[PDB]
Amino acid sequence: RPPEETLSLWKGEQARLKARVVDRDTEAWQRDPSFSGLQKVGGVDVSFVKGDSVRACASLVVLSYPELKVVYEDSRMVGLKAPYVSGFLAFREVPFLVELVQRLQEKEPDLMPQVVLVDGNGVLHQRGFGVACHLGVLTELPCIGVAKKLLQVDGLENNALHKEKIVLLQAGGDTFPLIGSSGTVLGMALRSHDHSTKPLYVSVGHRISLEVAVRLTHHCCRFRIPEPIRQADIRSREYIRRTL
């Protein structure tokens, strides 16, 4: 676990970049009732090795929309430089994802995604600047944060009341808002699939509104996990498994 000097630097870096986050729609396809004009959706993930604190595999996929077929994949082995500390996930993962986006620009610039689904939160975060905001600000791409568990910040808890609301979600697309103690909506719990009970936690990363982000996340869900994140997850784990 890092020294305080490193944590301060990281908090200071998060506060500096937070000023560049845009939490409204800035792309024409976002204001369209069926997202007409959206053709390419990105997904990123990093997989790790059970006995290894140094090596990891980072993946970027691009999928066509709305067919959700993989049209681009880049999976590469990387050397970790920071351990996992909750609230500082970007400093473990985002440097490698930025490089993957730069590599896409050099190899297949016409397949640059119009929005990236990130495994982890955006503005639903201890300091309002999670890994999905961090990636968005560093690449300037629109980003959505999709987390598989609830980050307990600003009075949010996975308590008895919270689980009552999860029971109330009955079908894919059903949602309920995640309200901070300041009264502000930090994200949405989303039941992504008809045949899944555990919701997703969706928040704004960059250059997108929450309502658009929730609706797009739902439209990418063949299973519980949205297909761009699901394919990056499957492919980066396969790469590690085959070289292990």
- Binding residue ranges: 45, 119
Contacts of 225 by beta carbon, 8 Å cutoff, 6+ apart: 146, 148, 192, 200, 233
Pick from 132, 43, 59, 146: nearest CA to 90:
132
Known binding-site residue numbers for Mg(2+): 45, 119
Q: If you write DSSP's letter for every residue of 161-230 in order, what string do you get?
A: HHHHHHHH--STT-EEEEE-TTS-EEEEEE---TT--SPEEEEEEESS-HHHHHHHHHHT-SSSS-HHHH
Minimum CB separation from Mn ion for residue 181, in Å?
Answer: 28
CB of 46 to Mn ion, least distance (A): 5
Q: Using alpha carbons, select from 186, 111, 178, 107 the residue that is nearest to residue 141.
A: 111
Which one of the spans 128-136, 160-168, 202-210, 233-241 is the region binding Mn ion (CB under 5 A)? 233-241
Binding string to Mn ion for residues 22 to 51, with x set by CB under 5 A, is what? -----------------------x------
The CA-atom distances, in angstroms, between 130 and each of 17, 105, 110, 163, 192 are 11, 24, 28, 24, 22
Q: Does 227 bind Mn ion (CB under 5 A)?
A: no
Min CB(167)–Mn ion separation in Å: 27
Regarding 119 and contact with Mn ion (CB under 5 A), the answer is yes
Q: Which of 141, 233, 235, 240 binds Mn ion (CB under 5 A)?
A: 233
- The reply to whether omega before 95 is within 30° of 0 (cis) is no
- Residue 23 or 45 with smaller CB distance to Mn ion: 45
The nearer residue to Mn ion, 115 or 169, going by C-beta atoms, is 115
Nearer to Mn ion, 148 or 163 (CB): 148
Q: Which is nearer to Mn ion, 23 or 119 (CB)?
A: 119
Binding-site ranges for Mn ion (CB under 5 A): 45, 119, 233
